[PDB]
Symmetry: C2
Subunit: 117 residues, 2 copies
């Protein structure tokens, strides 16, 4: 359970990181070399690619933040969690849900996201 | 959207099928030969295995049903949906959420399920 909360937190920390350099270092630590991401708006592969994708996403939504919603859960190497997108003025404008997979070495190898209203 | 509703319905139809034989037929049609399932209580692989798994599950929860909750959604070959577990007397006892993947030939090749309270 805590293992699932840590994974949710590590994942969102990468999306909320303001400094693009620090984010590459974060993705470098948390994500696997063979890693893949896909949601309804985007896709990416590899540590580099995912770091680039997140940066591109943030440039389109400057000032926005991802805040965890509810309690992450899971089983085996799977973690599931949800988050809300918060506007620079503090408005809840949307949200999503993700299923994240860890490889046998504890690093994120696969993420599939969805959008929520 | 409709493609995602159909997938959710086809998936649940297999879990709600009363006859074991009809269910093999249903899994045969909807599921891929190289297919895999895992949730917090179970796992299976292959058409045979998943058919067997569902049957074992139902033998432990006789009379229970799995009813769709909310609107399925998704993208690419991914579908996501949620369902509620209904007791023989009609009570809502619990639920789940699943992520289903279709292979390039339209058949289910991967499912990852999770449990939900209220």
């Amino acid at each position: 359970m805590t293992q699932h909360l840590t994974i949710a937190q590590t994942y969102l920390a990468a999306w909320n990181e303001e400094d693009n350099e620090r984010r590459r270092h974060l993705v470098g630590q948390a994500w696997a070399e063979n890693t893949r991401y896909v949601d309804p708006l985007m896709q990416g592969e590899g540590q580099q690619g995912i770091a680039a994708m997140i940066e591109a996403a943030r440039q389109k939504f400057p000032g926005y933040r991802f805040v965890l919603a509810g309690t992450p859960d899971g089983h085996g190497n799977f973690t599931r969690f949800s988050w809300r997108l918060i506007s620079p003025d503090g408005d809840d404008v949307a949200g999503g849900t993700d299923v994240v997979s860890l490889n046998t070495e504890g690093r994120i190898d696969n993420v599939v996201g969805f959008l929520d209203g």
